[PDB]
């Protein structure tokens, strides 16, 4: 509901068959048959979950669909599987080192599934009668919990009374108590007992009285990443650092102890390891120290599958003074397999543009689609994809529903691409600030 239409919202996964053969147009993915087949092979390895630490480099020219292929892999991966999509610039931080940030990105992409059984008694409290013991030990209580339908009486122990007096629950408060584990919550105050007070308190919350059965059974599946366990065991109250982010370079011995405990919890069967994918978009923006740490960190058994994206040619590696293919050193490319994405022809440009126009609910005419395809082949895919929405707004300002040739031509005239802007800058270089800072603001001499 909150999500708007983004650049990759039309992709619902890799458009493959059961034989890992890509369809020409399926699930929002058009073309790139070799790349989609290779990504389908990658997805199966993640789904097998029996091998660890493979580095996959998605390489190609820009606007060819490396990030589109990564989002297709993430959508085909399904839910409750840890997919961590980060950029290469996020590793450089201020209170975390680059290796520690890479370790946190690695351990956020592999988790454990844990099954929980809850016997929840949810209802409004009618009366709490406390049997006051003479010695004070084993304080018996009588809880009158009540739903819309029906109401029982529960016996309450001393720690139950201490938990129900630690948080302030009174008559008319909606609480649910777990029978197996004794978990305590306070959902708030019932709406039936809401008008008795003229002004509500600071922490007073109003919730509806639950209906149906008083006690309900539910099975809850929790997917907890390894980084979550690291942050929890790093501090006394570590759950705040899961959200505020000031974890602060978790020491190694916590990580080895957590790895050994995850192994023994696996061997006794109360949790199961779910591996996932860590996707580093624009991986060329990383230091050589980051690349060396990636090279050593891919060899652990608790390591996810690493998909890296690069649009660089033979470029200078960051942190050094020599050039390298993909902006990556040769020992990183040694422990990697490369998926190459190619450019699109006119039919693939037209199909992707039609899919993006259908996603944004824009009614493109045939001549407007042909003009946008010609502009996409001439300039770029992303220029025509950005031109579609402003042409839609131009046509809507003209009191028209569908777009025509004139709306696309007006959007082409109003908004420039890279080559036209380069030509306009190079024709009048005195009006812009040079690399030496020189400029001519004066219009006459």
């Amino acid at each position: 509901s909150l999500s708007l239409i983004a650049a990759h919202s039309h992709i619902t996964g890799l458009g493959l068959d059961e034989n890992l053969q890509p369809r020409p147009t399926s699930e929002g993915m058009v073309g790139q048959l070799q790349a989609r087949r290779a990504a389908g092979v990658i997805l199966k390895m993640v789904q097998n979950g029996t091998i660890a630490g493979r580095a996959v480099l998605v390489a190609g020219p820009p606007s060819t669909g490396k990030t589109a292929l990564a989002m297709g892999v993430s959508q085909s991966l399904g839910k409750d599987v840890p997919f961590t999509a980060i950029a290469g610039s996020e590793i450089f931080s201020l209170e975390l080192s680059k290796t520690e940030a890479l370790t946190q990105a690695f351990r956020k992409s592999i988790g454990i599934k844990i099954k929980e059984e809850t016997e929840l008694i949810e209802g409004e409290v009618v009366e709490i009668q406390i049997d006051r013991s003479i010695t004070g030990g084993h304080k018996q209580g009588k809880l009158t919990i009540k739903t819309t339908d029906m109401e029982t009486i529960y016996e309450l122990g001393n720690k139950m009374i201490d938990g129900l007096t630690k948080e302030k629950v009174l008559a008319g408060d909606v609480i649910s108590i777990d029978k197996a584990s004794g978990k305590i919550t306070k959902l708030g105050r019932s709406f039936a007992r809401s008008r008795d007070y003229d002004a509500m308190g600071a922490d007073t919350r109003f919730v509806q009285c639950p209906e149906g059965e008083l006690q309900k059974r539910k099975t809850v599946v929790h997917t907890v990443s390894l980084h979550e366990i690291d942050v929890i065991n790093s501090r006394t109250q570590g759950f705040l650092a899961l959200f505020t982010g000031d974890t602060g370079e978790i020491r190694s011995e916590v990580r080895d102890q957590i790895n050994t405990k995850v192994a023994e919890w696996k061997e006794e069967g109360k949790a199961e390891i779910v591996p996932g994918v860590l996707f580093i978009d624009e991986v060329h923006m990383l230091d050589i120290e980051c690349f060396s740490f990636i090279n050593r960190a891919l060899e652990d058994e608790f390591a996810p599958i690493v998909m890296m994206a690069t649009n660089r040619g033979v470029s200078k590696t960051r942190g050094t003074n020599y050039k390298s293919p993909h902006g990556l050193p040769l020992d990183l490319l040694d422990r990697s397999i490369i998926i190459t994405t190619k450019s699109y022809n006119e039919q693939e440009i037209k199909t992707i543009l039609s899919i993006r126009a259908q996603e944004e609910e824009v009614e493109l005419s045939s001549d407007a689609l042909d003009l946008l395809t010609k502009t996409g082949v001439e300039t770029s895919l992303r220029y025509s994809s950005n031109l579609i929405s402003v042409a839609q707004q131009i046509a809507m300002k003209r009191k028209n529903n569908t777009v025509e040739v004139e709306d696309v031509k007006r959007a082409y005239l109003l908004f420039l691409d890279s080559a036209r802007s380069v030509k306009y800058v190079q024709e009048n270089e005195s009006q812009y600030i040079d690399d030496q800072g020189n400029v001519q603001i004066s219009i006459a001499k």
Binding site: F92, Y197, T244, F415, A444, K445
Partner: protein, 437 residues
């Protein structure tokens, strides 16, 4: 008397109902094509459908890129969020620059929440706490009284705790918010002002209005406000603390888990109809000051599902990108980001619209300029720069006022040109002189 800034005279894009830019309308003159492009952009923003759209305003200095950005801001209205920013502001020494960019991204997505404000104001006449033990009080009966009459309320022990926090006794005008539960003691009434001849009590009058007052308000928050509301390393934002806490809270890298939880809570409140989502504009002037790492994170963050419309400004040409060594790119923006942009070209001016800009700035600053003085100012603007005349307009008015004249004359313009120099004359003085000017 209102002050005048550099962009005070601009009230909007000056377009009609058909989107065609009127030549002189809305504080603008000329620049019709970029104004129409910005009108298409604000129509796209008002559609409230797209995310991550990016437009770059490219043109020379003193051509109106920031003018068009603030014109977009007035065309959208104060309801739509607008985050103006400089590319230099992302370099923080507390948190990393990509986190600052993502925080400014979340600062441009807002929420409207309709809410009620109900207030009980007046002097406490009765304060009777009913205990009904099961030590612990059951409730408290509080009788407030103003000049229009009295009213009795039943309050929970939390509000009784807040009342006894404020040292509220019988005879004190107090303030109670029914929804929040906040209790504020205004002070003792003047009916009890003569119990002693001298005491530390602050004696305030009885409220002239009713005890109970209810009204409707709207809360305009952002997603960054809700992000920093529940991401505190040291909590306690609810308590009123005039003095600072003993440990200074520092800006931290907010994880994506809090962003997803905040998004889930906001979507749940939107699906109930309580809150309304308003996508807005993040404007970055002087985008050439961004590092290549910030450009890479901008490339990653423009593909988010909740990203706002980003408007970038630059005045450079074929320039090396900051943080690189040999990447010659237009406007200082790398070509991978440029592929995601829509470029709006900003044209220079000629003499006539420079003259009308000068006369519009003179009319807004309430200065009377004679016609030949206006022609001299326009000729100086064509010769030196437009902003030189726009900044010499006010010394001309001061030199006219010190000679007891309300009309700027040609001699005032000559005196202001003699007293204050432009960049070219000062550069000539710099070049001719030897000992550091």
């Amino acid at each position: 008397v209102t002050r005048t800034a550099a962009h005070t005279h601009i009230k909007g894009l000056g377009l009609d109902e058909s989107g065609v830019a009127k030549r002189v309308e809305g504080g603008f003159v000329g620049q019709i094509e970029a104004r129409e492009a910005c009108g298409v952009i604000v129509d796209l923003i008002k559609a409230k459908k797209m995310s991550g759209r990016a437009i770059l305003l490219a043109g020379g200095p003193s051509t109106g890129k920031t003018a068009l950005a603030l014109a977009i801001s007035q065309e959208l209205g104060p309801k739509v969020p607008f985050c103006p920013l400089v590319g230099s502001e992302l370099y923080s020494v507390e948190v990393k620059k990509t986190e600052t960019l993502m925080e400014n991204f979340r600062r441009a997505i807002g929420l409207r929440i309709k809410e009620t404000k109900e207030v009980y104001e007046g002097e406490v006449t009765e304060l009777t706490p009913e205990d009904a033990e099961n030590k612990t009080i059951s409730h408290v009966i509080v009788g407030l009284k103003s000049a229009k009459g009295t009213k009795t309320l039943r309050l929970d022990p939390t509000i009784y705790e807040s009342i006894q926090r404020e040292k509220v006794s019988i005879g004190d005008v107090i303030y109670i918010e029914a929804n929040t539960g906040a209790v504020k003691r205004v002070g003792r009434s003047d009916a009890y002002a003569t119990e002693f001849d001298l005491e530390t009590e602050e004696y305030v009058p009885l409220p002239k209005g009713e005890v109970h007052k209810k009204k409707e308000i709207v809360q305009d928050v952002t997603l960054h406000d809700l992000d920093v509301a529940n991401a505190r390393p040291q909590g306690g934002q609810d308590v009123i603390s005039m003095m600072g806490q003993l440990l200074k809270p520092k800006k931290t890298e907010i994880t994506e888990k809090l962003r997803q939880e905040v998004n889930k809570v906001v979507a749940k409140y939107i699906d109930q109809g309580v809150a309304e989502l308003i996508p807005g504009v993040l404007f970055i002037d002087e985008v050439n000051m961004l590092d290549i790492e910030i450009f890479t994170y901008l490339n990653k963050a423009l593909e988010s599902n909740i990203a706002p419309v980003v408007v970038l400004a630059s005045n450079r040409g074929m320039t090396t990108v900051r943080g690189t060594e040999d990447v010659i790119s237009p406007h200082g923006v790398p070509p991978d980001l440029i592929d995601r942009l829509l470029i709006v070209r900003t044209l220079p001016y000629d003499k006539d619209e420079i003259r009308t800009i000068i006369e519009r700035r003179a009319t807004v600053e309430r200065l009377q300029v004679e016609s030949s003085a206006l022609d001299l100012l326009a000729t100086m603007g064509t010769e030196t720069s437009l902003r030189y005349a726009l900044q010499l307009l006010a010394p001309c008015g001061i030199l006219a006022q010190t000679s007891n004249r309300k009309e700027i004359v040609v001699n005032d313009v000559n005196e202001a040109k003699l007293l204050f120099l432009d960049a070219k004359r000062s550069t000539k003085i710099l070049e001719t002189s030897a000992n550091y000017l």
